């Protein structure tokens, strides 16, 4: 019957509450899947919000799943386990590292009428799951 996973729609916050380059922690699509949204401050392809610069990612390293940290100075996610680094400005492109998958992108809907940011899906397979939706 269905070919798509049943992704929740999860409110993150309103776009205007986000500060430039200050990460917001949230879970998606369940409480075991930690994510980050960041207003990058300059447009990127597939950024959303008034300035087309809001992106979000699963922070679990796609190599072996250690939680990555967001580095505000480089706008990258850095893995402390085997030093993989992912570009938040290039859809999770691996700059250098041992992963074989770009950091999964959390798809955000920006609703102009409400200013609301909603997580509605994931592009790529989150670490340590048979399917994004358990």
């Amino acid at each position: 019957l269905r070919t798509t996973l049943q992704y929740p729609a999860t409110q993150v916050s309103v776009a205007k509450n986000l500060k430039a380059n200050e990460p917001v922690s949230f879970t998606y699509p369940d409480t075991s899947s930690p994510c980050v949204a960041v207003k990058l401050g300059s447009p990127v392809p597939g950024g959303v919000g008034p300035n087309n610069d809001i992106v979000a990612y699963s922070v679990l390293c796609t190599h072996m799943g250690c939680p990555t940290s967001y580095d505000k100075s480089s706008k990258t996610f850095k893995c402390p386990c085997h030093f993989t680094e992912f570009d938040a400005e290039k859809a999770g492109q691996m700059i250098c590292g041992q992963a074989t998958e770009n950091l999964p992108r959390v798809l955000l809907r920006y609703d102009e009428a409400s200013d609301a940011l909603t997580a509605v899906g994931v592009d790529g397979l989150i670490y340590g799951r048979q399917a994004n939706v358990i």
Binding site: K78, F83, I95, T100, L125, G128, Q130, A131
Partner: protein, 823 residues
């Protein structure tokens, strides 16, 4: 779909697979099951034994969609595959590099990254590529070899052939190809995939009595100090660095050192990099160990010999050597002290390394510890010195330092190659007494036929532009001569081609997985099979032999390289028998092989046995104790060569470390010191430096494997590295009005090539680093022809100018130019 994977069923077939790619030889499992079956999420209902009913914790698994595929066998049935690292393998403990992790993706499928695999013989019929039969290919190829042997002798038949392990090498394939080239054809006109004569990377260390793979990976766990010399191991030997070096730096192995040596001090482990360039490995070492536990000796390019002679002279002056060891187990020490004398002030002026850093290097590495023992200093080296300024002289200098300080044969030591590919060499002796620079011979118009066999020197030769220009020109003469032919027999066409090769032509054959850039010149391409489409044996950087098990069919009529060699030898034998030449026919006996196992039995397992011909084998005379069934039982842990013993009760028993009794591979069983003259840069290279602004350093990127033969079809790799990149100092970039994603021309007297600019704060003003061997902007065009006494090129030894072409707006849109040095 990108958001799920199909789990292997609990009862899925599982086979062993060593990584196709680097020296480390990480252990993998291959799960194979019917496409329409899947495992359940409960741990006892899938083959991984992992609980997918909830989030897995960190480090539980390495699993991504790139690690899965669906293959279609010759019977048309479809199977899931999953290729994942083996948690219980001692080499990698479940680690996978970005390069081995792609193995499932780079298995042959009609629709995936392997779609363009060679599937049939391909013939350039003067003016178009067409398919041809194996019997027609063999009639042409063997016809031309036979005509050349009959008129010119073996000197008319040229090869450039792998001599390595892993995929596109290993014990079966080096034997098949070596028996064919050396026993059967008997041609001395043979170069190796990575060097343009039939030679060794390690003549000096071997001659001094120290085979270059003399320790175990465990020795990196036991060291007090690790030197990494001309080596970027996070990128190029990832899981050796990650699974053995870092645990030492982190203090996770201190309790193992103390258990083994109860009465010895073990300070926190330290690490020393000899590299002109500040690399990802230096950055990661500093991150893990701290700046106070890392010494980056950022030497002037080509000054390794001066560094090692200074350190040698200093440890002798300090008495930080092992005099009893020198007296009992060495020859030539007093001579080496005289010939290699160099003060620290001279050493600093030549290398540019300050005296205080030279002293500190020696104090960490050689000065006795409080408990009285010398530090256990493991000296690891790779292409920065193997392709450095006089390969023979740098090993001479470094081994002198290592021998004097007893850093061979003690646990936690060794003076070892880090390695490139895996190793898997079994061959008859090279059949001449002469070192021959094969590229120069081809450029000068020698040879009737040239076969590239599992290599692509269009992308990887030194002075590559002179080579490609000559081969395309000599190829075109053959193509032009083939044009006049109408309804020609194979015999006639063999004569037409030979005549063209008398008029400066060259017939070109490539034996390969893919067309490659070679197809720009080749007249004939034959399809080969990689590990998993065949059984294969090889050993890693600690001599650990493993069997990679066949689990699928090759594409079309693709064949194991040893069986292609058998096919060629049997075609020639049949031609000589038919032509009434029983003595020439007999040269081509001994290739009655139905499977790659037959080449394993004929070569590796006959070395040193009664009745066997002369055989040079990394397995030695106990190679016969190894069989496929015994390696299967060993699993991905295999055995470290040489094998000491086999019985049913204990399996294969191996050798952890060489030289532990101070008996070296020399006439007198002593290690031999060598003179190491400091002559400066080779004149050829110094002429480029005097004329041009930038040092054109070159080598590996962690993500890109070799000539990108698989990666060129990988959408993720092409997004990330659409073009070869050149790391440039930012101040140099400003002066050239270039930034990330601009294209430059790089050029000097030897050639001209192109790269995308990658500003890197860590690069020194006047220095650069360009990705080698790539499919878009070949670095080797600007490398010189200069080689050492044994024809080893100074690939890392060249200078050129940089000219802006322009802004490539799509690179700026799509490619990260962010730092690859982890802070």
């Amino acid at each position: 779909p990108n958001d799920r994977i199909t789990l292997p069923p609990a009862n899925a077939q599982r086979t062993n697979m060593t990584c196709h790619f680097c020296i480390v030889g990480c252990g993998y499992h291959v799960y194979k099951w019917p496409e329409l079956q899947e495992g359940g999420r409960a741990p006892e209902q899938n083959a991984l034994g992992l609980d997918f009913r909830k989030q897995l914790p960190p480090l539980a698994v390495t699993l991504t969609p790139a690690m899965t595929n669906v293959v279609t066998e010759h019977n048309g049935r479809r199977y899931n595959i999953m290729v994942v690292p083996d948690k219980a393998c001692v080499v990698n403990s479940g680690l996978s590099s970005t390069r081995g992790g792609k193995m499932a993706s780079y298995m042959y499928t009609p629709t995936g990254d392997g779609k363009q695999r060679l599937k049939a013989p391909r013939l350039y019929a003067a003016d178009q590529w067409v398919d041809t039969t194996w019997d027609h290919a063999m009639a042409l190829y063997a016809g031309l070899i036979k005509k050349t042997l009959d008129k010119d002798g073996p000197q008319g038949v040229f090869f450039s052939c792998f001599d390595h392990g892993g995929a596109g090498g290993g014990f079966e394939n080096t034997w098949g190809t070596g028996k064919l080239m050396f026993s059967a054809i008997q041609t001395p006109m043979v170069r190796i995939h990575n060097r343009p004569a039939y030679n060794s990377e390690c003549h000096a260390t071997r001659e001094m009595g120290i085979g270059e793979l003399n320790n175990a990976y465990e020795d990196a766990q036991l060291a007090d100090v690790i030197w990494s010399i001309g080596n970027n191991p996070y990128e190029s030997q990832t899981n050796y660095f990650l699974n053995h070096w870092l645990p030492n730096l982190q203090g996770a192995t201190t309790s193992k050192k103390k258990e083994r040596f109860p009465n010895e001090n073990f300070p926190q482990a330290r690490i020393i990099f000899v590299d002109p360039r500040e690399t990802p490995s230096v950055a990661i070492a500093r991150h893990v160990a701290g700046n106070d536990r890392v010494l980056h000796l950022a030497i002037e390019p080509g000054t390794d010999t001066a560094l090692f002679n200074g350190l040698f002279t200093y440890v002798v002056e300090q008495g930080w050597i092992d005099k009893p060891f020198i007296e009992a187990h060495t020859k030539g020490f007093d001579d080496a002290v005289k010939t290699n004398r160099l003060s620290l002030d001279e050493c600093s002026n030549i290398t540019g390394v300050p005296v205080d850093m030279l002293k500190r290097a020696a104090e960490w590495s050689y000065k006795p510890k409080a408990s009285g023992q010398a530090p256990r200093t493991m000296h690891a080296y790779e292409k920065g010195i193997i392709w450095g300024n006089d390969n023979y002289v740098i090993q001479s200098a470094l081994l002198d330092l290592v021998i004097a300080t007893h850093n061979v044969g003690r646990r936690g030591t060794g003076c070892v190659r880090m390695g490139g590919h895996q190793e898997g060499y079994t061959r008859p002796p090279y059949p001449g007494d002469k070192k021959i620079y094969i590229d120069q011979e081809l450029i000068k118009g020698k040879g009737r036929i040239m076969t590239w066999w599992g290599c692509n020197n269009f992308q990887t030769s030194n002075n590559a532009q002179a080579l490609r220009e000559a081969i395309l020109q000599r190829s075109a003469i053959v193509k032009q001569a083939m044009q006049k032919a109408r309804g020609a027999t194979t015999e006639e066409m063999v004569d037409v081609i030979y005549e063209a090769t008398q008029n400066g032509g060259l017939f070109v054959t490539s034996i390969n997985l893919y067309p490659t850039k070679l197809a720009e010149a080749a007249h004939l391409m034959l399809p080969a099979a990689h590990p998993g489409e065949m059984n294969l044996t090889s050993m890693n950087g600690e001599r650990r032999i493993r069997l990679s098990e066949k689990f699928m069919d090759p594409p079309g009529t693709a064949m194991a390289d040893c069986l292609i060699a058998a096919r060629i030898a049997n075609a020639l034998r049949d031609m000589y028998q038919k032509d009434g030449k029983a003595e020439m026919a007999a040269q081509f006996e001994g290739f009655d092989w139905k499977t790659e196992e037959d080449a394993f039995n004929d070569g590796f397992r006959r070395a040193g046995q009664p009745g066997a011909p002369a055989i040079d084998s990394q397995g030695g005379s106990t190679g016969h104790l190894v069989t496929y069934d015994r390696l299967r039982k060993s699993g991905n842990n295999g055995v470290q060569l040489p094998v000491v013993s086999w019985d049913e009760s204990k399996g294969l028993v191996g050798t952890e470390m060489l030289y532990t009794e101070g008996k070296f591979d020399t006439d007198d069983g002593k290690a031999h010191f060598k003179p190491a003259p400091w002559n400066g840069l080779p004149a050829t290279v110094q002429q480029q430096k005097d004329k041009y602004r930038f040092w054109l350093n070159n080598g590996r990127n962690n993500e890109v494997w070799q000539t990108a033969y698989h990666d060129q079809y990988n959408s993720l790799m092409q997004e990330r590295y659409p073009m070869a990149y050149i790391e440039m100092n930012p101040d140099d970039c400003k002066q050239l009005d270039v930034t990330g994603g601009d294209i430059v021309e790089v050029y000097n007297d030897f050639g001209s090539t192109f790269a995308m600019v990658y500003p890197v704060a860590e690069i020194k003003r006047g220095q650069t680093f360009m990705l080698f061997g790539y499919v878009n902007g070949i670095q080797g065009d600007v490398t010189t022809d200069w080689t050492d006494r044994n024809i080893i090129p100074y690939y890392k030894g060249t200078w050129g100018d940089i000219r802006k072409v322009g802004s490539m707006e799509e690179f700026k849109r799509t490619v990260s130019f962010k730092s690859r040095r982890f802070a």
